[PDB]
Symmetry: none
Subunit: 285 residues, 6 copies
């Protein structure tokens, strides 16, 4: 009856009907100050990144084994892993269907490069966590550029095809990608819904700092390894991170990162919409 | 990229390193009697189907909640579900990268149409099983054309882009697509025992029994248990034999094999392909 | 030593000792305002409804697979299923022994029809739940008249055999039977916690959400799990509320409460019975 | 439609489609040699005793916790416990509806007296097994008469209401009730579905003899307590009963009961159809 | 190079936690009579600190404590295998150090006292795990082994190097009792609160209450639950107060303080030592 | 003195179970050279039985074992707090006995060895619980501590009372390795594969981890601590394909040969060689 399209996407629409997710759209419209894409073409870019992003979120909640998203049951907690995995993979390819409409020969070439960049990120993020091998500050920064720069580059990259603007923004995109992950990492451990990263066992920016700062100690890995829901251990864990100064080390990097963005944002000629956003996200750093 | 790639594909390489499962290539390789694609470009096409097909198995073992493949632990049984999903997702896009080498404008268009058909099939297959809604013979045949015909069509379609053979083979592909599924469906319940009865899947024979005896709910209630108990599996098969679903499945397969030869003959005759059907048909 | 009677009824006497709300007895004693039964025959009849009722509770706590009843461990959690099933089945026939004392030619004929009606109720309730086929609002209401109407109809029916009151009470009985089940359905999902979602049964609030939102399958997927998980359980209650199933239940109850008063007036009025309806209804207002 | 009856009766119909011995029917037709009931009422009684009997098996499979009946999966292994428990309780009352027929005042009274008798039987059998207290031979014989004599009494009891035959059959029924149960006890331990009574943990006639014959020993109770599915343990259990002579004791008891049956059958005037049936069952211990 | 650090990482964790060095304050005050050389005394104090701290690691598994001094328990972070082994290593590290004394009898004494120490803790565990409460005399008697063990070892070893020949065994016992009975009172008289009731151990107040009401079974029923539930614990203190166990403990604490002063006088007087008791004695009143 | 009953209950439980006291057989066998006085030898033999069995109570808690010598573990019956304390008690009961030797060096020697032993069990635990695998070199070196602790202690004490003055430490170390690696091989080859569920690093698993570095399959199966037979069955198959079982055997034969050569240099000991010949029949 062709309603099959409806049935398959209930898990996908479930995540959309959930609150939040404001940032993805703001960057695409804020970067448009330079790129200035046509309203017709721009709508395509926004719609596709919205799809890909949410689709990746369905997968990431299984990979992280998250129990709650935006305060609601994870999609697969209601529909089950088979239905969620398939629905997300379907959304992926629905995106490629839309990208082909861009009508640009290079849309497919760029779409492939960025998705592979993204999956190598989530691939490393999983390899380190699931093989209990801690990454250095150096590697972590590098895979984050893949993981979160993947969806950024796709949106700004696609826009670049239709713009007469030829100067390169890859440096600003990188700095923003890091600013986002490290901010989300910092907020995750600082302010139910308490230290969600400690239960998932992931290596966040502060936990990575504590692990190398105290080589003689083996406490942070033994707590991360437990994937504990126990608050008292988490409470102690946050205390330790404060004692070793891991929160102080992150802020100074964020403040350091924040500077590069303004310096880089000014050098491209300025975008008032974008500066307002950085000042905003940074108030909690 | 700098060996980052090795780590990511360990689960994928595990499934290849496992014995068997070489048929997908044999059918595509036999069709080259008609299509006659270039050897260089064809290696690209054959390589992609191996990648996509094997990658698709990594996912199907998570969906079917299968334990063990070809007598070995399921991929995620060793590496864990997060690691397996990403490697399989990674291989897909690695495939698309490979297709782009074809340099043919329409290769990407075809890759999309077929991959979407493949997911709707697997989607229906999952929806029915996990929402406990049994499909009719019409839908089941129809989803098999999507589910298993999807990756077939991808390979034959890509070959057809480079082939002078202009006559249409799509009717044979569907007829063949069904022949696989109904045979594997029959062999699974008729001969590590009754893997379909434990997974709770709707196979061709169980679908017949459910509709032949409307007053009964025995097969619906046994599939629902996802039972490993042998007595139920042993009884379940006995019931299917008494209700005549095995005769109906057999008669369908024998009918299907016939249509294939007739369709093969209108294409001018193909010795390599006919031998394979004769081979697969020995199961009944 | 003829002490065998003790052993046989030990699971039954256990459940009887637990405190309860004698809702059935109260309704029966209130209908005597019209029926005006002799005290002796009424004493026999009331004793029979108590036995039959409790016997069915022992059986239903196995079927609805309850963890506890009236806040205490379930009967079979202590004595084991074989002993309880036999104890309950035994009490049934002890009832038939008691009914024969009534001496009325039709007493047995009525007792058979009512038990045959009752089992079709508990039977359909199980058929739907265990074959995962949801009933329509119409189908549900009809089985409720059988399931809970069974002991009501039996108690008032036996009373009428000895009464000069000839006017018809079946409509009031139906209106009340629905009032009780649908109230219990609402109270369970609206106030350890939410036992109906874990047993997987279809109650009136869940049934409304299933037909009101046909595109969705969240309520069937949450019911299917038979989850003791609170986060999913809490989410489900929220979903039922947003879709308005709780409002629809309330408005349905109010329709019945009205019909009950109107029907009571047509039968000449009953202060004890109206007081009881006014009372139970204070909980959904 | 009113076809709900089908849906509610699916587990009951599953048990009927299975092969059996029809022995419940075979005696009823044989006892009719004296009673000579009209075909109309006899067909009703035959319908009722079949229902009650089969319904009780669905329940007996749950209480005994059996995992196989006549070689097929038990009723509740396929349909689930709730669906079977309700279906079984239903057939009971469907029976009472049917018994209401015959237009006899005493038919219901007899139906109750007997059904109450049967439940007191199954109750003792459960109390002993679940409280691990083995009954004495005298006690065991007594509850078996309730357990299986309960439903015998119902079929032959109802027939007598409509028969001019006034002579007494309770002594013959008792002797026959014992012969059946003690025969099933012997056959079960003497032949998948191997030695099913040992895993269910039941007290059989042979197992009860060994328990009292060797008081110092605690072996038969330790095997019953495990409820083992292990064949090797059961094979040993069979051996012990043989060394202690429980199987010999059962045979001599069966041989005596068979004899009492012939003498009692003759005292009622002789029954050619019935003796053929008894002579047949006796080949299993001779 | 040397794996000694890895093996003792749990032990170093426990040292870093805040605790009153009660053992060192008393042991160092007794030197007023013994007049031990600074060289030998430094070693003696070092061993007793080691043994005590290791003993706390083991007692945290045996007592099954949740946390200590407000921090996660030692094995709560490193796991039982790592902690138990790390602790036993510290034991033998003590034996190595005792051998440094160069005095022949140190090892004989170190064995006698360590064996006495384990015989105490053996009884303490057995009574608690068999749900059998000991008599007050039995409790006092094992306390002298369990906690008297390290006093005697610290004072005993010092005496090998002291010319003071008079007997200090009576005073040492008086203090050993004074401490344990003080900790017992403080635990129930008052952030982790009444940890002793959840661990289920027999303290001096509960031992009084259990025998004072022989007909009573209330304190045993709370001890068996090993509950973290606060309402039970708050009630439990209330019962002990009505039965007068807190008055009894105080009167005993007040009496021992007296016995200490009288006994300290016979040893000629020690200002540092008496000052300490006056201080610790402030806990009642 | 009745407390001694309560305190020694888990110790006595473990002592009562039948096992071939292999440690004791050597201690009695090395006496062919040492020729200790009968009175002093009885004490030394007595001390090793306590220390050995006492430590077994503790290792059953650390290795999270479920069975020891085929019976329930001590703490399964008496509870871990009660068992841990009883074991700690036996140690000091051991220390008490050594003093009866009346020899000045007994305690110095007893301390050195117990410290060596705990560094072993400590390293063994650090690796398993912090998920870092040791090299063959590291593994060999710590094993000499773990099992070499009591050998060195028993033979060391005898030599204090013995006229044999020449050096046996090289032979002792060679024997220490041979035992552990034998028990390691036997554990994964012939109540099934207890070493895989405990997650410990044994000699064969250690070889597979370094021989195939690009692979991470054995580390992921050890991490799971799975009781699953299918995963364990596969793991033995994998260890076999990489030849870790061949490398272990060749190592054992390498050790067996060194053992005979070292005994020959000491002048010969018939009791000892028969013992190695017997234990070595295990890989042939």
């Amino acid at each position: 009856q062709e309603t099959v399209q409806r049935i398959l996407l209930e898990p996908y629409k479930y995540l959309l009907q959930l609150p939040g997710k404001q940032v993805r759209t703001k960057l695409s419209q804020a970067f448009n100050h330079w790129l200035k894409v046509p309203e017709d073409k721009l709508q395509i870019i926004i719609e596709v990144t919205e799809m890909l992003h949410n689709a990746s979120l369905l997968i990431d909640d299984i990979e992280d084994n998250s129990k709650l998203r935006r305060g609601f049951p994870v999609a697969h907690s209601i529909y089950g892993i088979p239905s969620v995995i398939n629905s997300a993979n379907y959304v992926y390819f629905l995106g490629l269907e839309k990208v082909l409409t861009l009508d640009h020969q290079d849309a497919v070439k760029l779409f492939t490069r960025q998705l592979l960049e993204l999956h190598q990120g989530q691939g490393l993020d999983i390899y380190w966590r699931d093989n209990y091998t801690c990454p250095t500050e150096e590697e972590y920064k590098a895979m984050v550029l893949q993981k979160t720069g993947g969806l950024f580059g796709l949106a700004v990259g696609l826009m670049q095809l239709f713009s007469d603007y030829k100067e390169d923004l890859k440096p600003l995109l990188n700095t923003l990608g890091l600013f986002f992950q490290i901010r989300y990492d910092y907020a995750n451990l600082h302010s139910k819904s308490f230290c969600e990263d400690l239960t998932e066992g992931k290596f966040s920016f502060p936990t990575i700092h504590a692990i190398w700062s105290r080589p003689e100690s083996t406490q942070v890995q033994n707590i991360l390894r437990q994937r504990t829901e126990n608050i008292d251990i988490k409470k102690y864990c946050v205390h330790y991170l404060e004692d070793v100064g891991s929160f102080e080390y992150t802020r100074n990097t964020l403040k350091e990162l924040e500077a590069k963005a303004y310096k880089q944002i000014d050098a491209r000629g300025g975008n008032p919409e974008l500066v307002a956003l950085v000042k905003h996200l940074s108030k909690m750093f």
